[PDB]
Structure formats: structure tokens, C-alpha cells
Design a protein around this ligand. Structure first.
Ligand SMILES: [Mg+2]
Length: 664
């Protein structure tokens, strides 16, 4: 059922993805790379004292603070959901091999018994109403670009000036490029305007992953992560194999001379993709206004800031169901891309723009280096984009694509299992739009708070409440999938956007509180995804610009965890044992140094201004801007801080572009 074409790097089709410059050529050829990360300035992730610390701390905390999660996956008591062994990884050393990305998810979806389109006309109206509400009366804003981000295919530039020029040129030529694609001239659109080509596959670390201690043997066991070989990926699973990657770290002693303590493993590696910037720029120019609309008009469902902001909504509910989605991005349906595109056309969106958007979700993928002596292969033909990878992580609107799919999926689940009395309100497009507009503002007896694959579903008092409890029971039993669209289950230890919903003895939302996840504090402080990048002089371009700043926001972020004080004391005691130093004093020094360094980047900040005007969100984001790509948005960050991390194309150029895309 159609194998995807594959081209080696030597092939002209793969060569055309890389411009005639050192950076692009190095990206094409980059071999498998691994090595210890610089966790903090002058500290490697594999430092024997650091690993000794992780061994003592993970064992102590698991022993003294076992998980408090009930039969229904509700967190209570200590606010702990699993053991603390997740920190036991040799950061910077990946599992081998990493997965080859699936070229087609059609078989994957069919085999999981998931629908190949909207099941009913009601569902079709609801998905289409989501498009109408999300993409209608948008306001133009500057096109914001992350500083130090790559333009990927074909230039691989990290220079802001070059990136601004590429983005402005893309907005000027998007119409001509989209019209060429409408004629089936994909090679012309790419050759002339760099719109097309492929996604560039980067493998990112998921620094912490499940590890258990087998009581029978006293040996640690790492969670098996299934990977697809090349044959499996190209055939959509028809041929080839799906097998457990090797997380065994014993190899590091032989290969690198690194002492590996017992129960330490190689990190989970996830596929991530970088989009061709010229194609993403016209998409981002529409995506940002869409986010501004949904986070303002539909703030109830979509705009999530603090633990208290989430708590205020959830406390009003009689039932709160914390859902889990299996492998969201790989299962994301291509029929939804086509439905969205068809609906945008119906709304009066420029057909050339819709074509660029459609093409961004069918694009070939260039596989770099999943393992030593593997990769350097283009999957799919750029002359006719026809892949079904699901949702590409570097597509200009991935957050919105996952949010659109999931918000409707959850609403459909509430309608099907709890609220058949609301079906009469969804008769046609105008009534579907009115209903959805009301539901998204939190005006119905059925409610939700969601972001991509994370959500909490709510029921107030009323007719749907009894159904709500049956649905929760069906999820606990876990024998029947409640959705025809995605694989849905309940979360083992219900949390929403990093905050754990801590229930008391009553196990009711009205007396439950949102608290910071103490395990995430440990993940962020002792298992960062990236090194400090001490060699990158411009800190705003680093993956972790100001790591020291996270110490200042720690009490605000995690202070509400029942075991906060206990964890900090355990850290202090273990760090003294391992380094013969005070961890608290070490972090206070790093905080001071990073605070001083920050003023160099903020125009409004004098030589030694201090953190006085900054919010806890500002500080968490400056230590980890990745939180701005999954947890928060632009409006949540102080304006002067957002400027440290992002730069924009003028609203004059985007305003003109937006006028040409949008209906009449
Ligand atoms: Mg969740």
C-alpha cells in the first residue's frame, strides 16, 4: 500500500535540499554525534560526583516519598506520581538507534481502529466550526522569530538579519509560490522561493524517562522505547521491524572511558523536525494572529498561565477527567489537514496560501543520523509532496493543529458518552459555530481546558454529569477506546500543563488544588535537555540563556508541592555528600551571576537593576525558552523579556501580507 520513495544524500533530490555553504553542507553530512552535556558551567552530566549524587538522591526520595496516586489516577497526599529514578540518565548519550520517522501513518491509524475521516455529519460540522472560529476575524501582528533558530532547508542560517530578509522575501513571494504549487510546479516554487523541499530531522533528548527498580533482583530496568527501522518507516509498517532501542550505557566505558554506575541509562531520543523557513514564514504570519484570537476570545479553554488560573476553572466543576493521548504527533490525521484546507477555502482564504499550508503538512523528510553508520536519506519526493507523517514538529502551526484536533476530539467524547441532549444544538454550520463559541468560552455544562495533547475535561451539575462518571469508569477499566479519532486513556496522576491536580480525602475538584510537579523541578535542575552552550557568546541564542534565574522562580513554581522543603533538604544533604559544597549557595552564586548578565540584554535594565520587575514566568522562560514553545505564550511574558528571546519582521510588511491572504 505504497512505499515512500527514498533518496540517498548523493541523489540530486537530496543535494538540492542543501545550499552551497558550509553550514548547510555540514547539516547534510552530520554523522551520529554523542557526548556528555555541560549540565552547568564546568560540570559534565557524567561527572562521578554528580552521578553519585543522582544515585543517592533518586534512591532516598523514592524510598521516603512513594507515589500517592489512587485507582482513578488521582494524585493525593505527598503530590508524587512515580519514583524519582527518571534522573538516572547519562545526559547527552542517546538510546541506539533512534526511530526512522513513519512516512505514512494511514496503516498505523487503521490498525489502531481510528477513523479515516469525521464519523458523522455532526463531527464534520464541529471540526469545520473550529476552523471558522479560529481563523475568522484575525488582527495582524509582527512575525516573531526565535533568536539563534535555524532557517533549516536550504540555507541553515542562524543569523537574525538573514532570517528577517528570508521572512520578508517569503511574505512578498508567497503568492507567486502558492500559485506555482497550485499548478503542480513544486520544484519551481522551491527553486525560486525555497518553499518546499523537506523537513530536516533533528533527534532531541527526552532527558528523563521511566526507570523502575526490580525488587526481585535489585537491578534497575529502563522503559523500553519502540523504534522503527528504515523498512518499517517507508512502508508505513507493512514491512520491516518495530523493536526496543538500546538504552544500555555499559558501552560508554569501552567507547569513551566513562565510568558508568549501576542503573544509569542512555537517554530517550525523540524525532523533531525543522521546517524550511521560507515556507514557515507565511504560515507563522497567520498562526500568531490565530493564537492571539483563541487565547483572548477563547481564553477559558485555551489560555493557561498559573496554577491558580487553572484552579479557578476546575474548582467550579463537579467532575474533572485528566486525559492522556497516545503518540499524538504520529497519529495526527492527514484527513484533518485536508478538512482544514477545504474549510479555509470555503471561508474565502487565498487559495495560494491554503496550498502552502496544505504542502507544509505533506512535505518529505530528510533523515540525518538515527545511529552510527545510518541515515542521510530523504524520505518522499519533493517534486510531489505526498507524505502522511502525522504532525511535523517544525510546521509553523503545530500547536494549533494539535489543539484543533484535540479540542474537538474531547468535545465529541463528551457528546457521545455524556451529553446526547446537546446534539440538537448542532444542526448546520451557523448552529455548530454558535454552540462551539459558547462551549469554548466555558458557558456549557460540559467544559474543557486543553493545549494540544494535554487536557482536563469537566462537568458541572446537570444531565451530562451522570454520563461523565460512566465515561471516567470506562477510562479506568481501559477496555474500550472512547474516541474514534485518537487513542484516549486517563492520565496516571492527573496533571495539566506541568501542574498536578492535588485532591484531598473527598476526591472532588471543588477541594482539589493545582501544585507544581516536584519531579519536573528535579528534571529541570539535574537533567536539562541541553548543555549550557558556554561557547555561544550571545546568551539569548542559547537553548538555556540564563540557567541561574530558575532558582529565583523555584519557590513560586514548586513551593506549593507538599514535599517541597523535604526535597530541597534532601538535595542539600546529598550534594554535601557528593561535592562537599552547599547546593543552595552554589545556586545563589549562579543566580547572582545570571542576574548581572541579564541586564546586558534588557535595554530597560541598568548595569545592576536586579530581578524586581520580573515575574516567575519571565524567569522560568529565561532559564528555559522551550517553555515558550509548549507551556506559555508571548502575552504571558513581560514585553521587555520577550524582546530578549525574539525579534520581529515589521507589522507593516505582515499587515500587507495578511490583507492578501484573508477573506474580503
Ligand atoms: Mg495531562
Amino acid at each position: 500500500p505504497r512505499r515512500a520513495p527514498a533518496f540517498p544524500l548523493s541523489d540530486i533530490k537530496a543535494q538540492m535540499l542543501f545550499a552551497n555553504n558550509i553550514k548547510a553542507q555540514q547539516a547534510s553530512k552530520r554523522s551520529f554525534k554523542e557526548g556528555a552535556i555541560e549540565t552547568y558551567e564546568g560540570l559534565l552530566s557524567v561527572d562521578p560526583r554528580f552521578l553519585s549524587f543522582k544515585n543517592e538522591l533518586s534512591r532516598y526520595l523514592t524510598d521516603h516519598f512513594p507515589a500517592n496516586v489512587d485507582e482513578y489516577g488521582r494524585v493525593y497526599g505527598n503530590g508524587v506520581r512515580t519514583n524519582f529514578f527518571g534522573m538516572r540518565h547519562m545526559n547527552g548519550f542517546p538510546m541506539i538507534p533512534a526511530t526512522w520517522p513513519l512516512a505514512s501513518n494511514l496503516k498505523k491509524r487503521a490498525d489502531a481502529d481510528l477513523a479515516d475521516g469525521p464519523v458523522s455529519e455532526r463531527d464534520n460540522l464541529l471540526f469545520r466550526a473550529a476552523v471558522r472560529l479560529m481563523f475568522s476575524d484575525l488582527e495582524p501582528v509582527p512575525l516573531k522569530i526565535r533568536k539563534g533558530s535555524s532557517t533549516c532547508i536550504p540555507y541553515f542560517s542562524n543569523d537574525m538579519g538573514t532570517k528577517i530578509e528570508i521572512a520578508e522575501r517569503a511574505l512578498e513571494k508567497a503568492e507567486e509560490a502558492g500559485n506555482l504549487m497550485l499548478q503542480g510546479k513544486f520544484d519551481d516554487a522551491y527553486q525560486l522561493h525555497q518553499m518546499g523541499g523537506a523537513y530536516y530531522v533533528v533527534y532531541r533528548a527526552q532527558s528523563t524517562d521511566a526507570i523502575t527498580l526490580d525488587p526481585k533482583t535489585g537491578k534497575f530496568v529502563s522503559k523500553d522505547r519502540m523504534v522503527a527501522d528504515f523498512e518499517y518507516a517507508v512502508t508505513g509498517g507493512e514491512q520491516g521491524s518495530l523493536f526496543a532501542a538500546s538504552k544500555d550505557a555499559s558501552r560508554l566505558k569501552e567507547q569513551y572511558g566513562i565510568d558508568v554506575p549501576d542503573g544509569f541509562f542512555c537517554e530517550r531520543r525523540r524525532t523533531a523536525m525543522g521546517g524550511p523557513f521560507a515556507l514557515n514564514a507565511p504560515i507563522m504570519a497567520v498562526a500568531q494572529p490565530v493564537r492571539n484570537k483563541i487565547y483572548s476570545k477563547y481564553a477559558y479553554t485555551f489560555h493557561h498561565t498559573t496554577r491558580l488560573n487553572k484552579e479557578e476553572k476546575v474548582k467550579e466543576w463537579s467532575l474533572c477527567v485528566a486525559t492522556d493521548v497516545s503518540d499524538h504527533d504520529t497519529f495526527w490525521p492527514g484527513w484533518l489537514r485536508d478538512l482544514i484546507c477545504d474549510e479555509l477555502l470555503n471561508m474565502g482564504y487565498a487559495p495560494w496560501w491554503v496550498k502552502l499550508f496544505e504542502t507544509s503538512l505533506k512535505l518529505p523528510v530528510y533523515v540525518g543520523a538515527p545511529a552510527p553508520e545510518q541515515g542521510h536519506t530523504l524520505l518522499g519526493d519533493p517534486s510531489n509532496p505526498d507524505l502522511e507523517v502525522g504532525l511535523s514538529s517544525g510546521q509553523g502551526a503545530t500547536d494549533l493543529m494539535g489543539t484543533l484536533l484535540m479540542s474537538i476530539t474531547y468535545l465529541v467524547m463528551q457528546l457521545d458518552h455524556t451529553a446526547p441532549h446537546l446534539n440538537s444544538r448542532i444542526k448546520d454550520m451557523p448552529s455548530a459555530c454558535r454552540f462551539l463559541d459558547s462551549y469554548w468560552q466555558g458557558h456549557e455544562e460540559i467544559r474543557q481546558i486543553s493545549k494540544s495533547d494535554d487536557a482536563m475535561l469537566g462537568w458541572t451539575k446537570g444531565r451530562a454529569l451522570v454520563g461523565g462518571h460512566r465515561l471516567f469508569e470506562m477510562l479506568k477499566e481501559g477496555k474500550v477506546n472512547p474516541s474514534p479519532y485518537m487513542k484516549i486513556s486517563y492520565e496516571h496522576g492527573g496533571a495539566f500543563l506541568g501542574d498536578i491536580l492535588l485532591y484531598d480525602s473527598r476526591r472532588e475538584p471543588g477541594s482539589a488544588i493545582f501544585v507544581g510537579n516536584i519531579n519536573s523541578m528535579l528534571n529541570n535542575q539535574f537533567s536539562p535537555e541541553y548543555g549550557v552552550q558556554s561557547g555561544v557568546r550571545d546568551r539569548s541564542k542559547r537553548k538555556r540563556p540564563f540557567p541561574g534565574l530558575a532558582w529565583a522562580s523555584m519557590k513560586d513554581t514548586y513551593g506549593a508541592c507538599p514535599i517541597y522543603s523535604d526535597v530541597l533538604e534532601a538535595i542539600e544533604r546529598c550534594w554535601w555528600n557528593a561535592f562537599g559544597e552547599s547546593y543552595r549557595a552554589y545556586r545563589e552564586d549562579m543566580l547572582k551571576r545570571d542576574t548581572l548578565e541579564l541586564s546586558r540584554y534588557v535595554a530597560s535594565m541598568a548595569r545592576q537593576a536586579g530581578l524586581a520587575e520580573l515575574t516567575p514566568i519571565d524567569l522560568e522562560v529565561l532559564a528555559d525558552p522551550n517553555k515558550l514553545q509548549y507551556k506559555w505564550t508571548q502575552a504571558d511574558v513581560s514585553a521587555n523579556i520577550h524582546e530578549v528571546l525574539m525579534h520581529g519582521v515589521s507589522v507593516e510588511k505582515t499587515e500587507r501580507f495578511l490583507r492578501s491572504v484573508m477573506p474580503r
